[PDB]
Amino acid sequence: PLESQYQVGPLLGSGGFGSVYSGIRVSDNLPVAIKHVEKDRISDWGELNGTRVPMEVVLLKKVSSGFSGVIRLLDWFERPDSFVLILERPEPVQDLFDFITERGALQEELARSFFWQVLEAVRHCHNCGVLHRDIKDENILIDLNRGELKLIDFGSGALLKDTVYTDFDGTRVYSPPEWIRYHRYHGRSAAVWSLGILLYDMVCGDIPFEHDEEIIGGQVFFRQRVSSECQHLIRWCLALRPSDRPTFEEIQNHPWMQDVLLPQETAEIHLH
């Protein structure tokens, strides 16, 4: 019973996260987010046992662990017309889209710390067999007191595979040119493209491309002062041909990525 195990509060974010409600687990007063998904709106289905569940539940369960870089699924329920997902809710929180809107372009030291944490989170997903497919600032929560970032919203994700993907329901302005042009992509190199968009977003204050023509055009204009090392990493992630993009290892060994702050240092210097 969900209504007995949790005190359900008001809608979170007025629907901007979907049907996500504030909640508190009665057993130990743990803050939770209660996310409702309609069965009729579910694209991909998975199996858990023979239990047929939304793929989002499958992916969330596979990344659920002590690693704090991804949102933690605590439990889920099936209803006649929907599934209900119980997520551990950090507090206080602001998502990275709103953070950047309010702060503008981030100092590179702060962008480096945030980007590093996202890289570690995406590596965790991939190590667990999960491809997120919707990496963007809207899908990143900042724990403002701990300086820890959390990847959220696995509703566009897929099991990670090495063969080609021909479907996609993530965010188009973060999707790579081979998807725009050919409706085909491989998971890791597409993820690296979206991370280039995200890094540009952090250091310039908004994403670089709004239109298909800009995505495929292969030109990156910098609207803010950005170091040559950071520009190089961004341009490398945004290589037009997927095989020209860096691996996750090459990104984290890049000179711009060295000497990252710890999460607690990040919170004390930039967030408190």
């Binding site: 809107t101 919707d134 809207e138 919203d153 566009s156 329901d169 993530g170 188009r172």
Partner: peptide, 8 residues
């Protein structure tokens, strides 16, 4: 310049 969210 207009910064906006983008739906998935």
């Amino acid at each position: 310049r207009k910064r906006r969210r983008h739906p998935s």
